[PDB]
């Protein structure tokens, strides 16, 4: 009912540094398709 | 900071981690058909 | 589909279901997804 406000901050950094890590694998893999 | 969007923001990131995970499963198929 | 053994058995007892849906629903179980969890998911979208 109440967010920890500590693991949430860790989760946000963990989920953000990972998402970006996923886009980079798409722009390249997609670029190859066009190349 | 309303504390009702505080959690709503999570769903925004999540959806940013799912929709981006789906368009890749297709980008892998064409790489199997072309070759 | 081609999953006649599964599809045929499901159709008889159930009495009717989406042909495409059964093709997909069976797919998730083949991936080792929990049986109860899949039941909830089909119990959530409705």
């Amino acid at each position: 009912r109440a967010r920890n406000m500590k693991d949430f901050e860790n989760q946000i950094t963990e989920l953000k540094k990972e998402n970006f890590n996923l886009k980079l694998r798409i722009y390249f893999l997609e670029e190859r398709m066009q190349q | 900071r309303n504390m009702k969007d505080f959690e709503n923001q999570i769903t925004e990131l999540k959806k940013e981690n799912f929709n981006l995970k789906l368009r890749i499963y297709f980008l892998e198929e064409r790489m199997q058909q072309e070759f | 589909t081609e999953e006649m053994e599964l599809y045929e058995l499901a159709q008889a007892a159930g009495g009717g279901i989406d042909p495409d849906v059964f093709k997909i629903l069976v797919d998730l179980l083949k991936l080792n997804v929990a049986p109860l969890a899949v039941f909830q998911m089909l119990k959530s979208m409705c």
Binding site: - | - | L9, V21, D27, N32
Partner: protein, 95 residues
């Protein structure tokens, strides 16, 4: 990553949050198989009166042949407490 593809695909026919959060509700080991009790299977047979023996004679035969997903599929049918929920959607697809 196939599991994610299935959820979106199911949503299309299920087209009736519930997309993302529904993906983070499916959790299980990577390669293990979780046998389920067959006692529920008996109850499901009685629940459906469409076939007194058709839903039983054919099932026994399928059990004869080894099927990887045989055990869970039987469990899912028994756990369908909701009435006419899936059947209602199917009719729309045929039309």
């Amino acid at each position: 990553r196939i599991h994610h593809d299935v959820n979106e695909l199911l949503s299309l026919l299920r087209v009736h949050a519930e997309v993302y959060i529904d993906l983070l509700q499916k959790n299980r080991t990577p390669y293990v198989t979780t046998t389920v009790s067959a006692h529920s299977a008996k109850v499901k047979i009685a629940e459906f009166s469409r076939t007194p023996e058709d839903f039983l004679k054919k099932y026994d035969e399928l059990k004869s042949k080894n099927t990887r997903n045989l055990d869970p599929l039987v469990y899912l049918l028994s756990k369908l407490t909701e009435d006419k929920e899936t059947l209602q959607y199917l009719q729309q697809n045929a039309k």
